[PDB]
Design a binder for this molecule. Structure first.
Ligand SMILES: CCOP(=O)(COc1ccc(C[C@H](NC(=O)O[C@H]2CO[C@H]3OCC[C@H]32)[C@H](O)CN(CC(C)C)S(=O)(=O)c2ccc(OC)cc2)cc1)OCC
Lengths: 99, 99
């Protein structure tokens, strides 16, 4: 389907058993979510944007269900002000920008 | 046209008669550009990002071309890591998300 941008393109994802409201973000290389527990090993990382950088934990090969698809990708967990779905996952579900 | 998301959706914009590279950002409500000169008076605006809040200069009814499409709207100028085209302008050029 088509999602307009009149309002923030929010979606509900299902990850690690939990449901979270997230933002389909083409300006984000990676998916960044608020503090939560995830399985597997992780690597510390620093990601920056407007306002500076925040320290996050990087988890790979994470299953996430978005827009009816079960995509696999990297998830950065940390003190982000809003849950963000980055290009790393958007590509997996075949999402594109059109005009 | 269609833009996939395997790479950053960087496009050429024209503002103040100059060409610049900007990121089509569905996660941004507003368009924020790197330090530059714009005509007229500006108003103050506080915007929040992943790393915190920053102060930006708000200019209204500014002409800006994005991917060859002409738009006239609000442009914020401040300490952003890269030029970002927010929803205020993405909507002006008929940009949407599709899957
Ligand atoms: C202090 C926070 O206050 P807040 O109001 C704002 O909360 C956010 C934070 C980040 C984003 C995504 C970025 N949009 C944003 O900053 O938007 C700005 C401009 O429009 C305004 O409206 C939304 C917040 C202003 C942008 O799309 C992605 N950034 C990357 C890019 C600018 C280079 S990013 O989030 O820093 C990022 C993501 C993934 C990465 O992996 C490598 C790296 C970096 C949206 C909303 O929340 C209060 C509860």
């Amino acid at each position: 389907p088509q999602i307009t941008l009149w309002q923030r393109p929010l979606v509900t994802i299902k990850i690690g058993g939990q449901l979270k409201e997230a933002l389909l973000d083409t300006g984000a290389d990676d998916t960044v979510l608020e503090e939560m527990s995830l399985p597997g090993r992780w690597k510390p990382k620093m990601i920056g944007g407007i306002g500076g950088f925040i320290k996050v934990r990087q988890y790979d090969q994470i299953l996430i269900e978005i827009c009816g698809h079960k995509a696999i990708g990297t998830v950065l967990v940390g003190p982000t002000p809003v849950n963000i779905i980055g290009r790393n996952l958007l590509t997996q579900i075949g999402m594109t920008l059109n005009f």
